[PDB]
Design a protein around this ligand. Structure first.
Ligand code: 7V7
Lengths: 216, 222
C-alpha cells in the first residue's frame, strides 16, 4: 500500500565505477522486528524480472557480491560496485511491509561508452512485397552510441514529412551500443512515382549528415 | 530449481473475462505463496494477488472487485481471472513464487511472462519479406540482411535464424504499431560478406495468435 518512487528514468554510468540508484517510500519499511522490507529486482533486456536483494541486506542466490542496499527508513539506494556492461537493464525497488506488494517505476542503468557512429544500411522493397501492392524501404543504423539519432527520408531530394516509423534496440549487454530501424512504407503506386530513395542520418559520431540512397 | 510458465489467449475482447494459467514445475503449489503480477506497456508493475499453499487468496484492493484466483493441485497449476477487461488491462502478465513466511522471504522465481492485448479486432498474421543483402547493405567485409515481419496483430511474434544456429550479430527490433493499428518489425543479422556465396540465411517466424508460421530464405540481390 506504500508508495515506492524512483525519480530517475535512467542512470548513465561509466564502466568500473560504483553506480547508485535511488528509491523512496511513503512510509518506513523498517518493522519493529528490525527487518527492512525492501527488495531490488532487475529486468535485463528480453528477460523476466530477477531478484537481486531481499529485505535490504540479503543477496539472492547467484547474484554477485557487487550489489548492496543502503539508506534507512524511507530513503534507500541500490549500489552497484564496479559496473559491468552486462549490468544494463531496469532496476525496480519493491516493498511488502504492507500488502499489496508495490514497486518503484524502475530506473534504467545505461553504460556511457565512447561515441560510436552508426553503420547505415538501406534495403529496397522485395519483389514479393511489390507484387502485393506496397513498398517498404528499410534504413538500418547499426551499433552506435549515444541513442539519439535523426533519420530523415528524402525522395527525389524531397524531404518526407510522414509515412515512416522507427524502432530502437535496448542497449546491448556486450558492446553497449544501440541499433535502430527506420521504415518508410508507401503504396506501390506512390513508390513508382519517384526515382531516388534516400535516408539521411545525423548523429553525434558523424561529422556531417550521411545519406544512403538507391535508384528505384 | 523452480520453473513457472504462463499460458492463455494473447487476445481478449473488451468486456470479456481474461483467464490465464501458471504451470509450476520443480516445486509444489501446496507449499508457499503463488502470485500474479503484471507489467503495463510503459513498464509499471502492478501486484495483483496471491493464492496460498492452503488455497486462501489475497487480492490487491485496487483489483479485488475484478479478480479471482483459483488452483488445481492435481495439475500443479493456478489461474488468474480478470473481469470486464478494457485496453487499460493490456500488459505482460507474470506469475511468481513467494518463498518464506510472514517474517522472512521474497518473490524469488518469476515466470517468463505472457502478453495479453485487449481489443475487439481480429488476429492478423504477418507478411514476411526479405531484406536482401547488397552493396547498399555492406561495409567492407560486413553485410547486413534480414526479414521484415509486417502487418500482424497482436503481439508477440518470435523470430529465429537458421533454426537458432545463427545468433551472433542478430538484432530483432521491438515491434512498433503502425498507423493501421498493426505491428511491424525487422530482424537483421550482420555476416561476413564472403559467406553470402555458400551460406543460406533463413528467418523462421512464428505468430501463434494467427497460426502463421513462415520460413523465408533471404537471397542476395544486385
Ligand atoms: C506474497 C506473500 C507476502 O508477500 N506476504 C505474506 C507472507 C505470508 C502470509 C501472508 C502474506 C508478506 C510477507 C512480509 N510481511 C511483512 C509484514 C510482517 C512483518 C513481521 C511480522 C509479520 C508481518 C507481510 C506479508
Amino acid at each position: 500500500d506504500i508508495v515506492m518512487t524512483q525519480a530517475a528514468f535512467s542512470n548513465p554510468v561509466t564502466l568500473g565505477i560504483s553506480a547508485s540508484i535511488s528509491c523512496r517510500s511513503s512510509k518506513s519499511l523498517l518493522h519493529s522486528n528490525g527487518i527492512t522490507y525492501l527488495y531490488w529486482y532487475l529486468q535485463k533486456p528480453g528477460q523476466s524480472p530477477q531478484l537481486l536483494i531481499y529485505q535490504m541486506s540479503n543477496l539472492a542466490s547467484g547474484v554477485p557480491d557487487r550489489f548492496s542496499s543502503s539508506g534507512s527508513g524511507t530513503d534507500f539506494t541500490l549500489r552497484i560496485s564496479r559496473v559491468e556492461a552486462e549490468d544494463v537493464g531496469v532496476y525496480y525497488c519493491a516493498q511488502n511491509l504492507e500488502l499489496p506488494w508495490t514497486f518503484g517505476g524502475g530506473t534504467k542503468l545505461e553504460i556511457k561508452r565512447t561515441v560510436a557512429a552508426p553503420s547505415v544500411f538501406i534495403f529496397p522493397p522485395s519483389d514479393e512485397q511489390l507484387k502485393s501492392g506496397t513498398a517498404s524501404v528499410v534504413c538500418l543504423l547499426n551499433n552506435f552510441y549515444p541513442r539519439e539519432a535523426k533519420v530523415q527520408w528524402k525522395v527525389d531530394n524531397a524531404l518526407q514529412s510522414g509515412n515512416s516509423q522507427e524502432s530502437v534496440t535496448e542497449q546491448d549487454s556486450k558492446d553497449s551500443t544501440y541499433s535502430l530501424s527506420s521504415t518508410l512504407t508507401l503504396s506501390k503506386a506512390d513508390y513508382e512515382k519517384h526515382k531516388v530513395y534516400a535516408c539521411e542520418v545525423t548523429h553525434q559520431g558523424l561529422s556531417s549528415p550521411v545519406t544512403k540512397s538507391f535508384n528505384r | 530449481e523452480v520453473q513457472l510458465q504462463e499460458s492463455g489467449p494473447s487476445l481478449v475482447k473488451p468486456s470479456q473475462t481474461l483467464s490465464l494459467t501458471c504451470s509450476v514445475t520443480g516445486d509444489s503449489i501446496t507449499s508457499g505463496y503463488w502470485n500474479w503480477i503484471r507489467k503495463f506497456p510503459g513498464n509499471k508493475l502492478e501486484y495483483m494477488g496471491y493464492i496460498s499453499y492452503s488455497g486462501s487468496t489475497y487480492y490487491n484492493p485496487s483489483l479485488k472487485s475484478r479478480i479471482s484466483i483459483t488452483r488445481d493441485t492435481s495439475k500443479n497449476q493456478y489461474s488468474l481471472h480478470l473481469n470486464s477487461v478494457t485496453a487499460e488491462d493490456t500488459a505482460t502478465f507474470y506469475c511468481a513464487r513467494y518463498y518464506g513466511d510472514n517474517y522472512v522471504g521474497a518473490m524469488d522465481y518469476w515466470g517468463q511472462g505472457t502478453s495479453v492485448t485487449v481489443s475487439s479486432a481480429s488476429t492478423k498474421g504477418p507478411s514476411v519479406f526479405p531484406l536482401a543483402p547488397s552493396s547498399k547493405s555492406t561495409s567492407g567485409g560486413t553485410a547486413a540482411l534480414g526479414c521484415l515481419v509486417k502487418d500482424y496483430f497482436p503481439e508477440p511474434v518470435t523470430v529465429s535464424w537458421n533454426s537458432g544456429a545463427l545468433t551472433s550479430g542478430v538484432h530483432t527490433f521491438p515491434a512498433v504499431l503502425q498507423s493501421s493499428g498493426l505491428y511491424s518489425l525487422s530482424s537483421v543479422v550482420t555476416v561476413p560478406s564472403s559467406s553470402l556465396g555458400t551460406q543460406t540465411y533463413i528467418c523462421n517466424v512464428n505468430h501463434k495468435p494467427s497460426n502463421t508460421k513462415v520460413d523465408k530464405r533471404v537471397e542476395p540481390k544486385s
